[PDB]
């Protein structure tokens, strides 16, 4: 299957006193491996997976230096963006940045990305060609001109096709016991009767990794979306994920309905029946 | 590993 | 922009009375990031609740997991209480045991 390395940065201005909140998180696939929090005691990039603790002091010094550089750019950006949008010093505003690379099953480069948002809206994004920019509005267009003049796309393309995929491959190897392991969903059905004429069947998928999963209902072997509820996939808190899908059925007709579970960890999809 | 630099908007 | 949090309250493992477990409150789809999340035992705020590092989805909306160790019983009621700029009143979601 495909793999990804992604970094997520959140920047929140705190008008009244002092510096903005800065939070950085790094993931391989659906596994957090590093964090930085401006408000934490260490003022260091910190490990959040055992396989990254394999990295020497030089790694933690380098990642701490780079994440502090990211933090200072975001601090300046909050000021720049307040200027571009003619906003007062009084309001809290949010910057978000996400960048990273996807590799296929062969661990070769598939795609790179670098997306930036201001107050929860698209600002500027690197296009799939890693050579050009999507600017949402005229403030972002000013940034696009600046980044074109400074050859930012060329710098990011070199990282995304190079260091990003090289270090993703290193992490996948070092963390192979967990990162290269698929955890198939543990599945069961439950039954809930609201009235004498209506019952709800719930199809559960527990303790799976990675998070990507498809739960579908059929009635007499045909797909049914009517009278179904699918919850957002949610973290168990132990690194695995959970999901359920529910269908409302006439009391006594439970046997017509089947739940279908697709997951990377399953050689063939599972079928459950009440 | 993080990218080395971040150019301001 | 303002987006109101989605809330799921659930246990890590299928619950049995007297068996140590983890109570989760997963808050997602919200903006901006400032949010207040408490886990309640019989309406009283649980101390020393931990939470994940702030991250976000493709649409830029934030998600957090708040969690604590708990031992479920027959009588004890658990819930998640969420305040956010999008809510005129705190939202309380009761733990259902079969989510
Ligand atoms: Na930190
Ligand atoms: Na810190
Ligand atoms: Na934002
Ligand atoms: Na920037």
Numbering used by the authors:
A (entry chain A): 1 to 274
B (entry chain C): 1 to 9
C (entry chain B): 1 to 99
Task: Copy the relevant paper text.
The conformation of the peptide in the HLA-I groove is paramount not only for HLA-I-peptide affinity and stability, but also for the TCR-HLA-I-peptide interaction. To study this aspect, we individually refolded and crystallized HLA-A*02:01 with spliced epitope candidate KRAS5−6/8−14 G12V, non-spliced epitope candidate KRAS5−14 G12V, as well as two control peptides (peptides #1 and #2), in which either the N-terminal residue or one of the central residues was substituted, as compared to the epitope candidates. The global superposition of all these four peptide-HLA-I complexes in the peptide binding groove reveals a similar binding orientation with a root mean square deviation value (rmsd) of 0.124 Å. Throughout these interfaces, extensive hydrophobic and hydrogen bonding networking is seen with the majority of peptide residues participating in the contact with HLA-I residues Y7, F9, M45, E63, K66, V67, H70, T73, T80, L81, Y84, Y99, Y116, T143, K146, W147, V152, Y159, W167, Y171.
The KRAS5−6/8−14 G12V epitope candidate was confirmed to efficiently bind the HLA-A*02:01 complex, in contrast to the KRAS5−14 G12V non-spliced epitope candidate, which had a measured IC50 larger than 300 nM (and larger than predicted). Some structural differences in individual peptide binding were observed when comparing the 9 mer peptides (KRAS5−6/8−14 G12V [KL][VVGAVGV] and peptide #2 KLVVVAVGV) with the 10 mer peptides (KRAS5−14 G12V [KLVVVGAVGV] and peptide #1 YLVVVGAVGV). Specifically, while the N-terminal and C-terminal ends of all four peptides match perfectly, structural superposition reveals conformations in the middle portions of peptide KRAS5−6/8−14 G12V and peptide #2 unique from the remaining two peptide ligands (KRAS5−14 G12V and peptide #1). In contrast, although the structural superposition of KRAS5−6/8−14 G12V and KRAS5−14 G12V peptides bound to HLA-A*02:01 molecules reveals a similar type of HLA-I interaction network at their N-terminal and C-terminal regions, their structural arrangements deviate in their middle portions. Firstly, in the structure of HLA-A*02:01 complexed with spliced peptide KRAS5−6/8−14 G12V, the P6 A residue makes both hydrogen bonding and van der Waals contacts with the side chain of T73 residue of HLA-I, whereas the P6 G residue of KRAS5−14 G12V is not in contact with HLA-A*02:01 and its P7 A residue maintains only hydrophobic interactions with T73. In the HLA-I-KRAS5−6/8−14 G12V complex, the amino group of K146 forms a hydrogen bond with both the carbonyl oxygen of the PΩ-1 residue and the terminal PΩ residue.
